Amino acid sequence: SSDPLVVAASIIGILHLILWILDRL
Amino acid sequence: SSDPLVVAASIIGILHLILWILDRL
Amino acid sequence: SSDPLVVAASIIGILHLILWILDRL
Amino acid sequence: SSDPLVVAASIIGILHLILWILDRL
Ligand SMILES: N[C@]12C[C@H]3C[C@H](C[C@H](C3)C1)C2
Numbered sequence: 001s002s003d004p005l006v007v008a009a010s011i012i013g014i015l016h017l018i019l020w021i022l023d024r025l
Numbered sequence: 026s027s028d029p030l031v032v033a034a035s036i037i038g039i040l041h042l043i044l045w046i047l048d049r050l
Numbered sequence: 051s052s053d054p055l056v057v058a059a060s061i062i063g064i065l066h067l068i069l070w071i072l073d074r075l
Numbered sequence: 076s077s078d079p080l081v082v083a084a085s086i087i088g089i090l091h092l093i094l095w096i097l098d099r100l
């Protein structure tokens with residue numbers, strides 16, 4: 001288990017890489 | 026719970042995405 | 051122990067830096 | 076506590092933002 005803020009940052013991180021990849025594809 | 030280092034990096038990761046969006050718009 | 055979604059985001063974050071370094075060079 | 080893979084990704088995430096700022100400034 002993890003802190004809700006860490007879970008929130010994990011969702012944000014995944015979206016970050018997706019947008020970063022799409023911004024180049 | 027999460028380690029303090031993980032909580033700190035979570036805040037930093039959120040900041041990182043916010044900065045990337047603002048810098049992309 | 052960490053939430054599985056946090057472990058997934060950790061793997062994705064590590065990949066993110068690898069790709070980021072490769073794309074800048 | 077947090078998984079070592081999460082701790083590693085936290086260190087790497089912090090380093091990632093540092094490099095992003097330096098390259099931005
Ligand atoms: N990039 C991340 C660092 C830390 C571990 C994992 C989830 C959160 C917090 C964002 C990847």
Ligand SMILES: [Cl-]
Pocket residue numbers: 001002003006026027028031051052053056076077078081
């Ligand atoms: Cl955790």
